[PDB]
From a paper:
Though quickly modified, it is initially synthesised as a polysaccharide of alternating β-d-glucuronosyl and N-acetyl-α-d-glucosaminyl residues by exostosins. The HS chain can be initiated from the tetrasaccharide linker by [name] or (in some cases) by EXTL2, which add the first α-GlcNAc residue (GlcNAcT-I activity).
To gain further insight into the arrangement of these domains, we solved the structure of [name]ΔN by single-particle cryo-EM, producing a high-quality Coulomb potential map at 2.4 Å resolution. We then built and refined an ab initio model of the 170 kDa globular domain of an [name] homodimer. Within each chain, the GT47 and GT64 domains are connected by a linker region of 124 amino acids. The GT64 domain and linker region appear to contribute the most to the homodimeric interaction, which appears to be stabilised by a pair of intermolecular disulfide bridges between Cys793 and Cys915 in the GT64 domain. Inspection of the structure revealed that the [name] GT47 domain adopts a GT-B fold, with two distinct Rossman-fold subdomains. In spite of this sequence conservation, the GT47 domain of [name] exhibits several unique features that point to a loss of activity in this particular enzyme. Moreover, our structural alignment revealed that, in contrast to other GT-B structures, the [name] Cα4 helix exhibits an extra turn at its N-terminus that occludes a putative phosphate/donor sugar binding pocket.
Residue numbers in the entry:
A (entry chain B), B (entry chain A): 176 to 349, 374 to 557, 582 to 858, 869 to 919
Write the structure that this text describes.
């Protein structure tokens, strides 16, 4: 049988040449008129927009043809479908480097390609029999539910409380069948916990494969019961030759959508994208012989583990299942990863520099292409943000051991005291730490404050590790020609914004040449020694927000909602970006991967952009931010209530509150310490 | 073909009943006299010692029979081997729940079971043809190299420098053969980098399977060249029916032993334990068609990624390959995990309490059995310490979100201000944080200091969150009957040590009922408010060492070695356990999973136990410790030089320096802050 090492032509697909894809126009072939119109429409829309797609058929590494779900009843005959396949313009003789895509939307009994010879082409679909599944070569994909429609998070029930009305539920109609039915009916009768198990359909059943449990009713009927259940049961078909069915995949989709943790009875099943995804992290898979132990097992699991499973299922669904675009990207990424080609680089925000009248070292980029696609496979596919983009830098890059900088990897390192260590002097003379030398860029948002901007920019004169200052001009009116900008020793670049928005401060501007960004308001007052210590801390904590202003979130018992609080406190949960360090990676994520609703809300209130970034970074890392110094001030009411509303809405969007509390801040080691006369403090006041 | 869902009897193996194993005595059967004596000897030794093994054949979930590598030439005939198998006492009719183990030591051409019917039994061996490999049911295991011998880490070359003399090496003797040979010879001729590739054996080749590259010379000859090479090339057999061979596994073993990163040409191969292990993290697997791109790919990889690969290979080798005991444990663990049964609990240090003459809440235990074996599969098998033990607690347990304690999971939580937050008062009245309420236990080592012990114990009177005090009596002489122990409000338990050793303070005593341990010398002076703040920080940082005394390690340029330093410094790398918090988990690891050489050295110098624990915790987490307060003192020369030697030896044992620098310490949020009169500081002096 065909495998990737004896039916794929690698000569078309060099490692460095990218991943050019050619998509056939199905309207120019007999398939087009018989396709289900919504599938055709959505697929054409997503293929038109995809970055990998090319019109140049001669350079293509992969060819894509949509044969799709066809209208019922299927007019086309298998032999004539085969005849059309073998007649495609670039189906040279055997169809190597072709993937045939057949997306399921409405029918769970259609098996077009069962009697069709596909030569050397790969097949991506949701239904497979053992005689036509080739592991590692074929792809199991999710069904296309939301075609020409959007899934709204507002209708997804919240992740908490962990326990819902029913422990588990099942609805279906149709050797272990009798055993399973008796065991689950006994569980229902005993009433140790509330369950709702039905083995007949009240609403007329949907047509099904011969030995499969049929879906009951409409999609809206099922979600109503699934929204009330902690777990969702998925019983696999009794036929041993059936690897995966569209019905079981639909059940899995509907369970993951509303947060019911799937419980699969039967290990022979191949779940969608199972080659890349660790489904054990999001679903429980149990052998049918162990059905008598399912109730005990489900009762044994802890709340936090169950909640982690629910969260991982939400991630998987949103990233790979929810839209046609996601399905197409997942197919392309699976094929690209199998043949070890890196993802396409993520786009930067090109900007126009406003001309004005008045040594930087840039961090290296794109050093881990192959490592990220092949070596870090698990993190790439099972952790946010996902595998679809290649970033120039990443805060999770492995660091070298302490010895390497002395034994052959010292390029760029600046040890303290040459490796002997030392006191304040040796500390102030070198960055030290566990990573090479580095600079940072200041990003400043300004609006109708033309004079304070000059003063604040002048205050930045002489910062030791400053690469450049980026001034984001938000006002509709351009700066005047008579405005003399100060000479602070580093370039000042004024970038023109296409529209007025607080989200512009987190745009990944092309002008930013450093991993580190210092985000500062145009009227903030920071001493040089605070900035430098914060930079060192961030160098030690690259994946956190490291900043000066602190806030925390509080629970309102009478209303069972969250409140934003800014009193002085002994514990914190947010560090405002009015003065904070963070990695540019998060700017890309904020601008292009974070949900659109959050940015739209930021625009609506012209407020809460810092809260959104804290939400994002806590969601990614599951760690709180770092408070750097003792200061709390750095110098309306509706502006204050808007933030309570922002917090509540963001909780709705994410499904949970990602913020976490910290009960400590950081200071320099020898801060306020009584030293011997030979020693010197690291900082005079910090 | 047999699969686990149609040839395994789960009725013998309930989830809660453990994993009882019965091992046949091979001496009582015709196999025994023909076995290779060293394989037989080592296997019997390890089976005798294993915790899962039982002599009660009626309760056994699994049955193990060693047919092993046989003496060459093989006298026994396949039919007679089959005859003996089907005659085993508990081979009922078909051999269900049997695993046949055939370990390879000396021969790479022996294929005993090729013409043998095994019924429903599983087979664990190193050589498989496609007609006799059943994925998910059979096991690919490593060869038994170190039989009745020990692998010494002293002969393993250091992980750094990353680049060695040769970029890659190959030695072997014997469609892509000509392509590969020409490409690699061209790489050698071009001399962009130094390589040594030989396609004939200078020393007589070892016998090999028909289409396999034969091993050259003796094992000692190969390691000499492998020690000098950054990468090691592994070319798979040309026969498409050969899944895995003992020779390729031997090559992989030898590469992983000395830190040469394997480069495998051919993706059809099944590497050992590949169902559980992510080999992509430790090896590069490349299709043969891409041989022309191998040189570019190997040159592209960065030093840190290559070093991470080397470290992961070291972990995998030491955990699963190195000894016969490890191989047997891996086989048992793979089978146990496939059928979803938890690992056996790790042993505690039972102790005798010395009687003496003068509310605790215990943390819950064993709450994540199924989650750890099935849900956290990847972390369990691909991260240290490994999957072989079940721990009562773990510092990496997931934490709940902020909302859960208010919406149905509030059991044990003590929010600050009821969720509204607050100032010093509300802070001092509740623990707060992100995890439920908790206590800590004090562990105190004493020796010939009978009086200071009384005073120090008296100082502990009134600690708010103290569960009990454990006094580890090291002196050969017992405490006198006239010694009146103080009444400090909590139990004092004096535990008798079986021998005098500093390693006794990290023994996981049965008396310790808490996750947190406060390790304090019997003469240290700590104020109550320092201890409490440290406890809160640790509650926030459960996987770190959190403590007061700080030290750092320095590089000695003239000798290219490490030095221990205790001057005042602006950066730190160690927190001494003379006053520090840590998780009991690390006590289990120190006592039972850490290498024996380290503990033997601690005994030899009667010094350096704190340095060892810092090494361990940094190795596990790859994060530095946390320094809690500003104080540096809490009140011989050879004792000081011994520690330089300890550091160097530990670096030899681990293969690298795991310590990392930190340039900051932690303090309370409102420490030294000017508050409004309504607010109050969290601590008066901290
Ligand atoms: C410093 O701390 C104090 C004490 O925590 C804090 O005072 C609190 O402020 C909040 C917010 O203004 C108050 O809670 C509100 O009370 C009003 C009625 O007075 C309600 O209408 C509010 O409910 C709305 O908002 C909710 C979302 O937050 C919705 O779910 C709800 O449906 C309503 O739309 C809300 O309950 C609270 O009563 C006071 N408490 C006291 C003791 O004064 C103060 O704001 C903090 N100061 C700073 C600068 O942070
Ligand atoms: C405070 O800091 C100072 C300055 O760093 C520090 O003084 C240094 O102490 C070290 C250790 O005593 C000295 O280094 C040694 O020097 C002797 C010769 O004087 C050598 O024999 C030593 O080499 C042996 O040890 C090595 C392993 O460490 C082996 O690899 C080697 O083969 C030898 O066996 C070692 O080089 C160093 O010279 C001084 N430096 C100065 C400027 O004095 C002091 O110890 C620190 N104080 C405290 C309390 O930590
Ligand atoms: C890693 O991938 C990046 C992104 O594709 C590569 O950067 C491109 O390199 C080509 C060839 O030099 C240039 O023409 C492009 O302009 C680069 N793109 C960007 C965004 O800079 C990079 O060469 C790759 N590095 C490797 C393979 O080592
Ligand atoms: C998780 O595993 C532990 C360890 O095997 C179980 O603890 C044992 O439980 C049995 C039955 O109650 C006792 O007889 C043993 O003494 C316990 N061992 C120890 C070391 O305490 C625990 O019951 C399991 N929890 C589950 C399955 O929920």
């Amino acid at each position: 049988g065909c495998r990737l090492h004896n039916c794929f032509d690698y000569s078309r697909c060099p490692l460095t040449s990218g991943f050019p894809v050619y998509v056939y126009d199905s309207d120019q072939f007999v398939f087009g008129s018989y396709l289900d119109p919504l599938v055709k429409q959505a697929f054409q829309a997503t293929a038109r927009a995809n970055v990998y797609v090319t019109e140049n058929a001669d350079i293509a590494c992969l060819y894509v043809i949509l044969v799709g779900e066809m209208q019922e009843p299927v007019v086309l005959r298998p032999a004539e479908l085969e005849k059309q396949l073998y007649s495609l313009p670039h189906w040279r003789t055997d169809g190597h480097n072709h993937v045939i895509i057949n997306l399921s939307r409405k029918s769970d009994t259609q098996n077009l390609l069962y009697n069709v010879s596909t030569g050397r082409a790969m097949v991506a679909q949701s239904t497979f029999y053992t005689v036509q599944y080739r592991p590692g070569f074929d792809l199991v994909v999710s069904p296309l539910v939301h075609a020409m429609s959007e899934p709204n998070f507002m209708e997804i029930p919240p992740q908490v409380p962990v326990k819902r009305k029913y422990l588990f539920t099942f609805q279906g109609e149709k050797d272990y069948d009798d055993r399973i039915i008796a065991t689950l009916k006994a569980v229902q009768d005993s009433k140790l916990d509330q369950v709702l198990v039905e083995f007949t359909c009240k609403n007329q059943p949907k047509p099904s494969l011969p030995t499969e449990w049929a879906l009951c009713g409409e999609r809206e009927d099922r979600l109503e019961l699934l929204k009330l259940s902690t777990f969702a049961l998925i019983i696999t078909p009794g036929d041993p030759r059936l690897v995966i069915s569209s019905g079981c995949a639909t059940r899995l989709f509907e369970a993951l959508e509303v947060g019911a943790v799937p419980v699969v009875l039967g290990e022979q099943v191949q779940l969608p994208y199972q080659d890349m995804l660790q489904w054990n992290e999001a679903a429980l898979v149990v052998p049918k012989p162990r059905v008598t132990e399912v109730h005990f097992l489900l009762r044994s699991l802890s709340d936090s583990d169950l909640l982690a499973m629910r969260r991982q299922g939400r991630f998987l669904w949103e990233t790979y299942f929810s839209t046609a675009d996601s399905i197409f990207n997942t197919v392309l990424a699976m094929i690209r990863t199998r043949i070890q080609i890196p993802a396409a680089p993520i786009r930067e925000e090109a900007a126009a520099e406003i001309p004005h009248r008045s040594p930087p070292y840039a961090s290296p980029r794109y050093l881990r292409n192959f490592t990220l696609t092949v070596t870090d496979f698990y993190r790439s596919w099972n952790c946010a943000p996902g595998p679809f983009h290649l970033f120039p830098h990443t805060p999770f890059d492995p660091v070298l051991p302490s010895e390497a900088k002395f034994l052959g990897s010292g390029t760029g390192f600046r040890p303290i005291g040459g490796g002997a260590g030392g006191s304040g002097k040796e500390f102030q003379a070198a960055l030290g730490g566990n990573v090479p030398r580095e600079q940072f860029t200041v990003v400043m948002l300004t609006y109708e404050r033309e004079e304070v901007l000059m003063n604040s920019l002048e205050r930045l004169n002489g910062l030791p590790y400053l690469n450049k200052v980026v001034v984001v001009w938000n006002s509709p009116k351009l700066p005047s020609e008579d405005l003399l900008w100060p000479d602070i020793g580093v370039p000042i670049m004024v970038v023109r914004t296409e529209k007025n928005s607080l989200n512009n401060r987190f745009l990944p501007w092309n002008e930013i040449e450093t991993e580190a960004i210092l985000s500062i308001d145009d009227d903030a007052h920071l001493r040089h020694d605070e900035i430098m210590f914060g930079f060192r801390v961030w160098r030690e904590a690259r994946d956190r927000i490291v900043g000066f202003p602190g806030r925390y979130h509080a629970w309102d018992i009478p209303h069972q909602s969250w409140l934003y609080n800014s009193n002085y406190s002994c514990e914190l949960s947010m560090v405002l970006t009015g003065a904070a360090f963070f990695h540019k990676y998060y700017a890309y994520l904020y601008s292009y991967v974070m949900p659109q609703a959050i940015r739209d809300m930021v625009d609506e209130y012209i407020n809460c952009e810092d809260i959104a970034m804290n939400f994002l970074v806590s969601h990614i890392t599951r760690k709180p931010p770092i408070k750097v110094t003792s200061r709390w001030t750095f110098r309306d009411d509706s502006h204050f209530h808007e933030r309570h509303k922002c917090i509540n809405f963001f909780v709705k969007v994410y499904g949970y509150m990602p913020l976490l509390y910290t009960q400590f801040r950081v200071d320099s080691v020898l801060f306020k310490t009584r030293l011997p006369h030979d020693k010197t403090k690291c900082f005079k006041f910090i």
